[PDB]
């Protein structure tokens, strides 16, 4: 069969690295048409939903161990913030065919046997009976579960214990003084006010709740608009209807309330924020049905249970949330210490997320833009409730580890009190017994309660060829999925062991693979051998060791915890960009670039190195977190003019600021076009602030420093360049 072939290369001959490789699809899943019931491109799981580190699975343990390559799965149930965008086929007749023994679901790889009266399970080979329903003008072959690897069903009654719940929201807002002064409360109230119709309400059932919190927990009874304020204070930190109300039936009233809140605490002098007590109030408030507790704060918890200092209450809280189906999202925005390391656990183990906004301050008009945009997209994002996800492997395959934000203790089941849309997950697969078939399989199942009062089951079935050729295993290795694997292992090693240990782990992943490819595979002088499909692996890991998450040196605790929290939950596509940035050379930008094709055409990305930064050029750096517009110090007045209006480069805007609208400048338009395009994604909430930097007072040095550190291919501080990294590796895998 056409098993992917090995394409040997010399890493030393590919410097600078051919980074366009980062946008290439993984190695093909070689599956002959006969193994699929209805052959098509939809017959095998798409890389967008699931990516195995190995698309040519080792036929046995000893081979897996020898390859030194990891076996994991980058799983991503949803692709967009809104379920109306590109949904998979949806089954509705209620017929769910499953194997009696392993419980796997009917899929494109089962084999129909005995005149097609029965079916042999591809996961455990058990013989199962074909329900007479299957053939009730269409045949069984017209069914989505037989036609598609990725599809969905309307779950029957026995997959539910209680009627699907309504989308419930409880906003826990910090109204203490730090929040008033920074403008966080205002910005938050405003954004909600501006987005009440962005919040999903597909079944018109969505319920909301508002908790203002300082030293006491402030409640609000909201009447039905149809019967036309009540603020109930509770300072007793030791201690439902009309508190959690219909977003529709109380639309005007909820609006009326949000509008007064800013006035109510307009002159609050209290600096206490009882997160602990408040978190408990919200729990009791929505625990009878479960839902989302979205915390907005710019004040370190300092009163009541759970207070922190410059805690395990939270971890136990998450344990409790898993019982009542509650998820906690956090938006931490302040110039002061927030202990992201500790609070991020709330979201992490409840399937939610924590968003950290360093130095947030209403005084900077641009701080507001970032927070509101992201907070708005976050509340407008669709999600599931009471969801559980598990992966079933074919005989010989076992799911041993699970990474990502969710709740998992001692089972193969991952619980999501709510399943967001913007995160990714990873499962480690161990091969115990030897695989006997020429193929093995993995099937992800997600039992969920959609935010439209419906119970569904989303299935993702992936088929991989087995092989006993070490060459073939490497030839089909997914460099990016593998990069992701080690990224998660690194975060764990970091968020649990040592930061240095994580660095050590990262580097070893490269050393072992390089040493293995060298000894296990067989004219020249001194190349650093590897195959084309793994050609970006050395770069990514090396680049990862320079990321704010693993950097040697000094990084503020919150900025580090945050970076670590992000790398662990980012969708593959953005994880890679967060590790290795897209850099654009604008001054010599092709004419198509900056203009439509309403999607803007982007210039081709250049290597992330200051080597290519001409002192007279214009460059745009995108690292998934921010955007840096770098203009050379010796840029021609024409260029300086075409972009900002003046000709004095020293008269250019500096720092976190937007690019001015320069009339009659078509170039100025194309620049603003590229920046706006880089800002729209229908899959993440991220709004990247723009930083303008001038090259060749102390603020200007700081910006150059920051922008410059994004170019991960360069020697940065105490880390060698990529060029040297490779040389270091070559010296190590030598005798």
């Amino acid at each position: 069969r056409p098993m992917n072939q090995l394409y040997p290369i010399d890493l030393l001959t590919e410097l600078p690295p051919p980074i366009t490789d980062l946008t290439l699809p993984p190695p093909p899943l070689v599956i002959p048409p006969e193994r699929m019931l209805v052959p098509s491109e939809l017959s095998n799981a798409s890389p967008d939903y699931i990516r195995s580190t190995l698309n040519a699975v080792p036929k046995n343990s000893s081979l897996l161990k020898k390859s030194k390559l990891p076996f994991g799965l980058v799983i991503r149930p949803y692709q967009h913030l809104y379920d109306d965008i590109d949904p998979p086929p949806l089954n509705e007749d209620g017929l769910i065919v499953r194997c009696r023994r392993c419980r796997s679901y009917m899929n494109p790889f089962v084999t129909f046997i005995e005149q097609g009266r029965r079916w042999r399970c591809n996961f455990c080979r058990l013989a199962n009976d074909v329900p007479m329903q299957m053939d009730q003008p269409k045949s069984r072959y017209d069914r989505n579960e037989i036609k598609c690897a990725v599809m969905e069903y309307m779950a029957p009654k026995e997959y539910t214990l209680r009627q699907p719940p309504p989308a419930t929201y409880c906003f826990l807002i910090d109204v203490s003084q730090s929040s008033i002064k920074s403008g966080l409360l205002a910005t938050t109230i405003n954004t909600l006010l501006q987005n009440l119709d962005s919040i999903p309400n597909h079944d018109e059932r969505t319920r909301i709740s508002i908790l203002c919190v300082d030293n006491a927990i402030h409640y609000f009874k909201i009447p039905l608009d149809s019967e036309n304020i009540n603020m109930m204070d509770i300072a007793d930190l030791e201690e439902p209807n009309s508190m959690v109300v219909s977003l529709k039936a109380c639309r005007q009233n909820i609006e009326t309330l949000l509008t007064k809140i800013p006035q109510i605490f307009q002159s609050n002098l209290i600096t206490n924020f009882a997160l602990g007590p408040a978190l408990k109030s919200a729990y009791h408030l929505i625990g009878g049905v479960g839902g989302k507790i979205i915390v907005v704060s710019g004040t370190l918890p300092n009163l009541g249970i759970g207070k922190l200092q410059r805690d395990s209450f939270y971890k136990n809280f998450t344990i409790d949330c898993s019982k009542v189906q509650i998820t906690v999202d956090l938006f931490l925005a302040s110039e002061d210490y927030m202990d992201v390391a500790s609070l991020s656990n709330l979201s992490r183990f409840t399937a939610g997320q924590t968003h950290f906004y360093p130095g947030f301050s209403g005084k900077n008009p641009n701080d507001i833009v970032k927070f509101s945009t992201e907070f708005a997209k976050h509340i407008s994002m669709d999600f599931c409730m009471e969801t559980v996800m598990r992966a079933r492997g074919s005989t010989g395959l076992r799911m041993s580890r699970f990474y990502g934000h969710f709740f998992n203790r001692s089972s193969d089941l991952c619980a999501f009190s709510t399943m967001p849309r913007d995160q990714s997950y990873l499962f480690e697969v161990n091969v115990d017994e030897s695989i006997m078939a020429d193929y093995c399989y993995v099937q992800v199942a997600v039992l969920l309660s959609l935010n439209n009062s419906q119970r569904r089951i989303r299935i993702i079935t992936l088929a991989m060829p087995t092989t006993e050729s070490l060459a073939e295993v490497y030839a089909s290795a997914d460099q990016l999925a593998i990069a992701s694997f080690y990224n998660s292992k690194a975060v764990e090693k970091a968020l649990n062991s040592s930061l240095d240990d994580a660095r050590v782990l990262i580097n070893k992943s490269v050393q072992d693979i390089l040493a293995t490819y060298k000894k296990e595979i067989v004219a020249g002088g001194a190349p650093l051998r590897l195959c084309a499909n793994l050609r970006m692996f050395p770069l990514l890991m090396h680049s990862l060791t320079k990321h704010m998450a693993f950097r040697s040196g000094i990084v503020p605790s919150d900025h580090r915890a945050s970076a670590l929290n992000n790398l662990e939950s980012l969708p593959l596509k953005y994880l890679i960009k967060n590790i290795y940035p897209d850099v654009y050379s604008l001054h010599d930008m092709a004419d198509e670039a900056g203009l439509p094709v309403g999607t803007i055409v982007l210039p081709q990305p250049i290597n992330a190195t200051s080597s290519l930064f001409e002192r007279y050029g214009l460059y745009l750096i995108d690292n998934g977190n921010e955007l840096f517009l770098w203009m050379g110090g010796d840029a021609v007045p024409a260029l300086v003019f075409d972009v900002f209006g003046t000709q004095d480069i020293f008269d250019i805007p500096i720092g976190k600021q937007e690019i001015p609208v320069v009339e009659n400048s078509e170039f100025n338009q194309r620049v603003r076009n590229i920046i706006n395009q880089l800002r729209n994604h229908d899959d993440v909430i991220t709004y990247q602030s723009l930083y303008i930097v001038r090259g060749a007072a102390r603020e200007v040095a700081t910006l150059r420093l920051w922008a410059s550190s994004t170019l991960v291919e360069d020697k940065i501080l105490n880390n060698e360049s990529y060029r040297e990294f490779l040389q270091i590796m070559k010296a190590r895998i030598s005798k």
């Binding site: 419980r103 026995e158 997959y159 559980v388 089951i457």
Partner: peptide
């Protein structure tokens, strides 16, 4: 505890 709605066992 080792028993869930998705397994259907």
């Amino acid at each position: 505890q080792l028993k869930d709605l998705e397994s259907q066992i």
